[PDB]
Write a protein that binds this ligand. Sequence first.
Ligand SMILES: *Cc1c(COP(=O)(O)O)cnc(C)c1O
Ligand SMILES: *Cc1c(COP(=O)(O)O)cnc(C)c1O
Ligand SMILES: O=C(O)CCC(=O)C(=O)O
Ligand SMILES: O=C(O)CCC(=O)C(=O)O
Ligand SMILES: O=C(O)CCC(=O)C(=O)O
Ligand SMILES: O=C(O)CCC(=O)C(=O)O
Lengths: 404, 404
Amino acid sequence: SMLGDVERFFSKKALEMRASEVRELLKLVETSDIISLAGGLPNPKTFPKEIIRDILVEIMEKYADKALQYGTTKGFTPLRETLMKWLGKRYGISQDNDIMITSGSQQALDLIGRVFLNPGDIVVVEAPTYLAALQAFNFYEPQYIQIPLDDEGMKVEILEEKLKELKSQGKKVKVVYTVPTFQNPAGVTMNEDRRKYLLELASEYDFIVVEDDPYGELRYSGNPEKKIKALDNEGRVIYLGTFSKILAPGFRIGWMVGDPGIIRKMEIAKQSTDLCTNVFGQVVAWRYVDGGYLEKHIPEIRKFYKPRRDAMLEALEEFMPEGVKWTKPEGGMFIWVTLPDGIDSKKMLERAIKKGVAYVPGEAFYAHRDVKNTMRLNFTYVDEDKIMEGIKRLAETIKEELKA
Amino acid sequence: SMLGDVERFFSKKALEMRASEVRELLKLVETSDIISLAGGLPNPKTFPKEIIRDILVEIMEKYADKALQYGTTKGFTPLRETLMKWLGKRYGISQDNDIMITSGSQQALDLIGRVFLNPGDIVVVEAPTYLAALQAFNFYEPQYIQIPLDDEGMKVEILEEKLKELKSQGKKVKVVYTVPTFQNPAGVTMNEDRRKYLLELASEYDFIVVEDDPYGELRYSGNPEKKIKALDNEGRVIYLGTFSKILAPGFRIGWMVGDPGIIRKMEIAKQSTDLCTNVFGQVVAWRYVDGGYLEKHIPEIRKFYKPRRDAMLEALEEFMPEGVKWTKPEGGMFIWVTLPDGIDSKKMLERAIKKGVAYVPGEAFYAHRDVKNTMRLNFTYVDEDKIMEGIKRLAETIKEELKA
Ligand SMILES: *Cc1c(COP(=O)(O)O)cnc(C)c1O
Ligand SMILES: *Cc1c(COP(=O)(O)O)cnc(C)c1O
Ligand SMILES: O=C(O)CCC(=O)C(=O)O
Ligand SMILES: O=C(O)CCC(=O)C(=O)O
Ligand SMILES: O=C(O)CCC(=O)C(=O)O
Ligand SMILES: O=C(O)CCC(=O)C(=O)O
């Protein structure tokens, strides 16, 4: 820095912000010739580029001044309308909710932190959970309770146990954050009984549920789940959707649906953080949905990623040694691996990289960083031939690690 | 709300957030038949729609995967490069600074609050200043010191007086926020001597200067100023630019240029607030600048708004009664009016609306809401016939108001 000790200017929160050594290393990996299973990106082969070109032409013909001008903080009205209609018809979400457009679900998470969290308020997350949600919420200094997953999602019985324990300490939870379908990073899905159990708990213990759902349309097998927000009779759930994996992440458009009183506060908070979400992308998204292109494209996304999920699940079954376990996702972008303990996967990444493969060590996905034998693998953005070879190199890395 | 007292969930900052009665009244005015001088929008006639159409075609032919994919938090590299080149050549800004792309300068102002401000830290603003900057900063609970303007911008001598008084109280300012060229809302420009004086103060009293410059290219008369950032040999200035008034606001792209240590902290802060600025708009902005379209288009924006500024200034001279004063901007979007005091322009707005005209009462633009006889008028997005008529209606409103 030109100012020398620039830290003398920074706020208490800024002084706590740091770069992750692992995220930095992984950035270097992506641009080199290693086979990386560490990515979190959708494959550009799935971006509907013809449909996007046609929509861009249409916007410059018919909607140019709307797409190019400032928008309201709440969002482009026709997008908000088409979304609520889509969500009602497709998922059974109640039209009594209100909706705001966000600059990605990442912004929704930050706005949830702003609007709900005082320092020390208690947020429940899954263990593991989405690392960027911990990052959004951490600015607001919550205390976390983490609830393990199993192959059917959050262990909602352990949440009831922890809620009773907190109540006995005179404390309560303000928000439960869940990624209940094709989780990033675990890949598993909360079963229907647990969804309804979660909402009974939300009523009994008086908390809000944030349901973050980027992946529900990326379903490759099994039958559609019921959205937690579709089961929500009390208006306790805030549902987050995003265009990032169903259109393309480059437009940075998402939406937040929930109780009108909550949405009004969110609108005020957002006004000072970014004024409005880019209106040009909102118009593109509106045509994409209203023009029926979303509905027509979703099957092509599923057809693309399904064989990639399958190649990775086949390669794990064939190559992994005894005592390694992995989830079997019905959709989404990730498979989550557990190493016969106590291999530490963060320590093992060095070795894996040396053998020409990378993954994300699972420790960052735990609010308490207390589980060390997990890894997130991604199958969306590399290719079957490299999925097989990558998984073999990871399997030999684990066999080598299991010795002295 | 369906949750009843939904306030029971809200954070302390959320509980303070309110909608503005004036802004809500003005949203209603905009849609109706009144002549509004209250707007803050550029005119869509200045959007370079043909150039935009050609760039969109180009992006889908050559840059589609980059425009559609997630980007880095820091921004799309070719845009960052082209902007630092433009800034160096056109304004003499030093290439030792770093740059980050923002989701609008609104997001820059929020990130400055995040990164610099603890509760009670002292921010200096002009009186008046940009109301959305007070909104971004308010979440972080600063104390403000306000420094009046005159027809040559901030009275930097009164700032030196206030810095000495604060020093005698054992206190310091952390940030000075200035909109030094064609201010929103006042229209005036800080002279060269004051820019240099401000920077000697920034050295002597050790504070950071934020230079928000949305308008420097919208110059209609006079000669170009030197950017404060161009005079900054110590790296104390963070310069904010935006594409809102020189391209179109619908892409929501801005940039922040300053010391690399500060920029690095900003990048970490931004990562959890929105992940990245929308990359599709970043690629549009990159072609717009790198392809030489910005340079070619800037004279057409100036040709467009100049006669509207001129019509407004002619109408005020012909119609306004004795004792009314207004600024004489060399550029930008606004003229700022002072009523022979006593008149409260917020009270008067009711009367003006009844006579068919609206403006923004000046009070919201003061950190201490302590000046009551000012108004912001806009000339960009009403038309010359309606500017003359609207100024006449406003003039008659003030004549009527002056009769006790
Ligand atoms: C993919 C992902 C998102 C996407 O966030 P955006 O800001 O909309 O791109 C959000 N939540 C989770 C859990 C994700 O995996
Ligand atoms: C127009 C204006 C802006 C624009 O902010 P964006 O978020 O980039 O659209 C910023 N600052 C001031 C002083 C303005 O008048
Ligand atoms: O840039 C990234 O990896 C974060 C994008 C994202 O949301 C994801 O990885 O799923
Ligand atoms: O469609 C999906 O993949 C998730 C459901 C949704 O609305 C979203 O995209 O966020
Ligand atoms: O809607 C508005 O007026 C706020 C947007 C803005 O930047 C401005 O007005 O100059
Ligand atoms: O272009 C202007 O009008 C101001 C200069 C700038 O870089 C910006 O637009 O913010």
